[PDB]
Amino acid sequence: RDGKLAKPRQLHNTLWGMVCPAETPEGHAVGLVKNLALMAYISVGSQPSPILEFLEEWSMENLEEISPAAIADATKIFVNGCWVGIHKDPEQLMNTLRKLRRQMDIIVSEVSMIRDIREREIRIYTDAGRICRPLLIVEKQKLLLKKRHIDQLKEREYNNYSWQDLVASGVVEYIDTLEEETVMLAMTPDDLQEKEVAYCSTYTHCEIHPSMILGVCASIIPFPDHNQSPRNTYQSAMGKQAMG
Amino acid sequence: GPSSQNVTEYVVRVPKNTTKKYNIMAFNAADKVNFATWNQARLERDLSNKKIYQEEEMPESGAGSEFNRKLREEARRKKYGIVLKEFRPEDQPWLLRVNGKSGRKFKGIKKGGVTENTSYYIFTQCPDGAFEAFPVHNWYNFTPLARHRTLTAEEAEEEWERRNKVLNHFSIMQQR
Amino acid sequence: FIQMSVQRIVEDAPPIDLQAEAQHASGEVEEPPRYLLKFEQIYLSKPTH
Amino acid sequence: QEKMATNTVYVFAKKDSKYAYTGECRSCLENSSRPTSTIWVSMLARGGQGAKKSAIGQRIVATLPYIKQEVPIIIVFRALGFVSDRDILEHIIYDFEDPEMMEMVKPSLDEAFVIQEQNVALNFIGSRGAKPGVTKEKRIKYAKEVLQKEMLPHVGVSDFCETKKAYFLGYMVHRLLLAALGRRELDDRDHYGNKRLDLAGPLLAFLFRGMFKNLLKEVRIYAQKFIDRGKDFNLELAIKTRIIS
Amino acid sequence: AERGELDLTGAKQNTGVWLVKVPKYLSQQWAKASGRGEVGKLRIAKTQGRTEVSFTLNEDLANIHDIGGKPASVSAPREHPFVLQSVGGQTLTVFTESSSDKLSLEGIVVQRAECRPAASENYMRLKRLQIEESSKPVRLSQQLDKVVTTNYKPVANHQYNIEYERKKKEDGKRARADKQHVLDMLFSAFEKHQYYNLKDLVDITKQPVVYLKEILKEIGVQNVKGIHKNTWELKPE
């Protein structure tokens, strides 16, 4: 509606992991109708009022306090599009917020941290509308998830160990589309962990499973890669209008 | 030297009740105004805040959000009484007049939130050695203002200036 | 929505001022009455029919 | 549904008409009323006059909300309490030591010498909205509420927010000039990170807010008959339980 | 001797004052000082290349609390170092205002400091102070299970019963005789302004509309006066 005349849709790079590509109707509503991936959490919105108080104590001035003409050395930071201050040390600025985010202190289901160097802009958005999903945290080209935590997952059927306790351990975190752009993503903790032949060893995040890009009807057909790519989209229109 | 060897130790006290308020009067280091060249000053309140009064011209005056008391539903109903003059008891900027009236006039905008995150305390050097704390009540940032100017005629010379923009400022001040 | 959105709007100022008419030349008018309402917290019980 | 991310300055390409660039940016409230408020800052593509200025390509004349025609953006800086070019240049960029960024803002500084007094800038904005007779005093009050409550409502709607609001407008102008010169690419519209969604939060809050103003409106109608007759205030009657449902 | 007269004293004597930024969790503790207003001592250590300025709280002040219990702070005092800031680029002056509408001047700020902790607290206690200071249900409701409370039925109406008590006190049905008192009250009304409204004469007098027309059409004449509303005035002839 708000914008037309020679504006195709096609496929965007940000659709990976967020929207199921092989799930669209076969009629005239193809491309326009979107869906959701298998593992994806939708933001609901939060108030960045306890967050703003902590940032002011970590060496940060105010707009109506100093002058921007004599500060051309620090890096600006944005909160919901508005400027809140700067920080003379941009290295430990994002590193301190990252450690507290993994210690059950910052809401990982809404607050997202983004660090950029080309634009020198640190944007932080906590409003509803973004799509986030958990990923495997990779530290020092190795998987942070310990084998001992696998036994605790089976204890849920006997004692108590829900998903809330695993997020507080610091091995998993919700990553949206903005934070994923400024970080590195891996495939599987096996081939990329080999120090023999590897072009880069600076991985930060990793996918949960390669089959997470599919949706509800897309996960019904076995082996979607061995078939033709447009033929996989017809399955979502057939399984919906079927009996059973 | 004395600023890199002397080690002192004093006592700081924070009084509870006071007999006078405490504020901050900021200037500008880019102007470099000598403080010893000031003889007298008349620091009073703002005068431009006591000018506007009537504002019952709607929607004749315009609008794009239907600001009728903020309801954008009904219309008319002569009862806009909502633009009453209230130069707060404390929300009015100061008006400094150094050396007469047309000598040196300053004007600044009052800061919004002053005790939202932190507070400002003023420490003074008492003759006995101890320190006294002065709680800051409000913040101010004065700006330099020109003297007598008055360009005169803003609605009759602006339409003709944008049409061609072929004139000089020397022909405007001479007519006045 | 049924925890913070239904109260954030009420958190502002739902009540509005209301002053009665003057009606002079009718004895001792002094001051006309002025009524004002006030809210507090929203409530939502179990769904009943 | 799906909508684009608000409160974010984006640079698009609009070269189909007489324009060249367009910096669309919304300004909706958090959780209050969010009256959209889209800031339209476009760049024209006209070039060549004849014998007057012959430099119309360096103009900006953005499309401010409500406003009929297009007005320059440097006139707004005169109304924000800044009458010097040193302060206005500080809002745009915090480092004016780059001679390349000067040739783009130098022709725009000529449009500010026609209005020097702060009270005059408040009259030029309200004069293009309508025509409330010949009284210039009433045109000042309208420009005071639009600049605070209508223009950029997310940064604050208070009276003392004009100082904080001036620095936010300078960053929007400097970001558009980088993509219109040769130091920044064009923002993508199909980028999912630059868009949001509309679930059971902001959508249901609009219906709960629309009928909320109607509830207070129906009570005020019954309240108008109270001052006419002169009985006792009845609250259980003015509250309608079916119009909202 | 004038109201808005600024006493220029510190501008000619050059008084050097300081500025210390104190947050909210520390200002609430200094509000309940012991004695007159003693909060502790200040230790200033200046070496050949390092300036360490730390503040020490008082022993008696370290045992009081405010708007909460505040654990691990009502026992022994801690160290509060200061972080010096730059004051160049903006001249900061301090002026006062007496209660008797009198202004004065203190001096010029020459040093600015801030209260920043250093190796005393990480984050295990700072997060608790944000919740204890609030002590609110965060505006949101706390449910109510279910209730069946209704309204009262006073076999009538609360807005109509009160009107019946005032209507029976003085009814508008009045008598009239000898048109003289009504005409005598017209001199006390038309003396101020020339013309008036028809509805204004009904509230002043005590006669109905069907009877007031017989008097206004005897010594007066009606006119629209360009305002459409019925405007009555006295006969100029």
Which chain E residues in 145-204 lie under 8 Å from chain C, judged by CB atoms?
145-147, 200, 203-204
Domain ranges of chain B: 1-176
Q: Where are the beta strands (DSSP E) in D71-126?
A: none
Rounded to an integer, what distance in angstroms lies between the CA atom of residue B102 and that of residue B115? 35
Nearest CA in chain A to E124: A105
Q: Where are the beta strands (DSSP E) in D95-204?
A: 195-197
Reference E116, options E19, E20, E40, E17; nearest CA is E20
Q: Which residues in chain C are contacts of E145 at CB distance < 8 A?
A: 45-46
Task: Identify the chains in contact with C, defined as 3+ C-beta pairs within 8 A.
Answer: D, E
The amino acid at D122: L
Rounded to an integer, what distance in angstroms lies between the CA atom of residue A220 and that of residue A238? 11
D213 is in an annotated binding site: yes
Burial of E29 (0-12, 13-18, 19+ CB in 10 A): buried
Nearest CA in chain C to E146: C45
Contact B123 E16 (CB under 8 A): no
Kind and range of the H or E element at D218?
A: helix D202-229
Residues linked to residue B131 through DSSP beta bridges, in sequence order: B12, B125
Residues 6+ apart with CB under 8 A from D10: D4, D23, D24, D25, D187, D194
Rounded to an integer, what distance in angstroms lies between the CA atom of residue B46 and that of residue B109? 10
Domain ranges of chain D: 10-197
CA distances, A217 to each of A214, A222, A234, D81 (Å): 8, 11, 10, 60
Which pair of tokens denotes residue E145? 């299970």
The amino acid at D222: Y
Nearest CA in chain A to E133: A50
Q: Is E136 on the interface with A (CB under 8 A)?
A: no
Name the method of structure determination: cryo-EM
Rounded to an integer, what distance in angstroms lies between the CA atom of residue D25 and that of residue D11? 9
Please state the residue numbers annotated as binding site of A for RNA: 241
Contact B111 A53 (CB under 8 A): no
Q: Which residues in chain D are contacts of E163 at CB distance < 8 A?
A: 229-232
Question: E126 in helix, strand or coil?
Answer: helix
Which pair of tokens denotes residue D31? 């959780």
Facing A42 at nearest CB: one of D16, D188, D197: D197
Interface of E with D (CB under 8 A): 151, 157-160, 162-163
Rounded to an integer, what distance in angstroms lies between the CA atom of residue D182 and that of residue E70? 56
Question: D134 in helix, strand or coil?
Answer: coil
Rounded to an integer, what distance in angstroms lies between the CA atom of residue B93 and that of residue B145? 14
CA distances, E16 to each of E44, E106, E113 (Å): 17, 9, 14
Contact E141 C41 (CB under 8 A): yes
What is the residue whose two structure tokens read 């708000």?
Answer: A2
Nearest CA in chain D to B150: D117
Contact A64 B118 (CB under 8 A): no
CATH topology of domain E171-233: Arc Repressor Mutant, subunit A (1.10.10)
Specify whether the CB–CB gap between B56 and B78 falls below 8 A.
Answer: yes
CATH topology of domain D10-197: 3.90.1110
Residues 6+ apart with CB under 8 A from A69: D90, D94, E89
Specify whether the CB–CB gap between B91 and B110 falls below 8 A.
Answer: yes
Nearest CA in chain D to B77: D224
Contact D205 C5 (CB under 8 A): yes
Which chain B residues in 18-77 lie under 8 Å from chain E, judged by CB atoms?
19-30, 35-36, 38-45
Q: Can you spell out the DSSP letters for chain A?
A: --S-SS------GGGTTTS-TT---SSTTTTTS----SS-EE------HHHHHHHHHTT---TTTS-GGG-TTSEEEEETTEEEEEES-HHHHHHHHHHHHTTT-S-TTT------SSS-EEEE--STT-EEEEEEEEETTEE---THHHHHHHGGGTS---HHHHHTTTSEEEE-HHHHHTS-EES-TTTTT-SSS-S-----EE-S-GGGG--TTTTTSS-SSSS-HHHHHHHHHHHHT---
